[PDB]
Amino acid sequence: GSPGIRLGSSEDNFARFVCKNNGVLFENQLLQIGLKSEFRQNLGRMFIFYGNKTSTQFLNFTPTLICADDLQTNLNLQTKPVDPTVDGGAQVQQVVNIECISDFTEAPVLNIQFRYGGTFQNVSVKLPITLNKFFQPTEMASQDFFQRWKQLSNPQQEVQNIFKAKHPMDTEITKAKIIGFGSALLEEVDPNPANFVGAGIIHTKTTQIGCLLRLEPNLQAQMYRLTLRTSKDTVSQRLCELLSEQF
């Protein structure tokens, strides 16, 4: 969160990669950075595609991943060097292996440096590696769900956000958003068929966080009430912020 117009900034399309893994993360007039990713347990693999849109080669093409001081102890990224020479119109691929150590909020920074026509081209963009990517969806009957829902003791483990919808409140879109977010989508848990209930486990090296959630649309008001309940306060916080921005 920064002050000032978010256009041509480091996170123009970051939000579009929270509930889906593929797409074009950034594109200026020389380069297009695409993404393809997959996650399992507390791990993942992200493919980064660098497309040269010009008629000439990029030289000394050097992409670097940067994780803030805290992020680093919570997220582990490993990758191999990319050939510093990218022909015009060509695409070069970089594989990033991901390991989530513990829950985190911050996002890694992708820095790209390269020479074009003899000039220094420098690009920075936030990498859409978010906490919900390490979700293991967990289907369960309504009875099980409520049993688990009422085991919350810590009031801090319950985060509720009442917000204005930033998008049309389409049902099918909303469904896809929740499924894409990562938890399982449980049917017939909330008696009101217009609401959505979710449940899943967030996987990290050191701890497994059980998470429950409830999304309540109010069509006339054009508002939502999202309710998160997990076994870890910081997890409940981060997932609520992430999901809130999607609707």
Added chain:
Amino acid sequence: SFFEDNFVP
């Protein structure tokens, strides 16, 4: 089912 309360009044 039964959440304690409901957003939509």
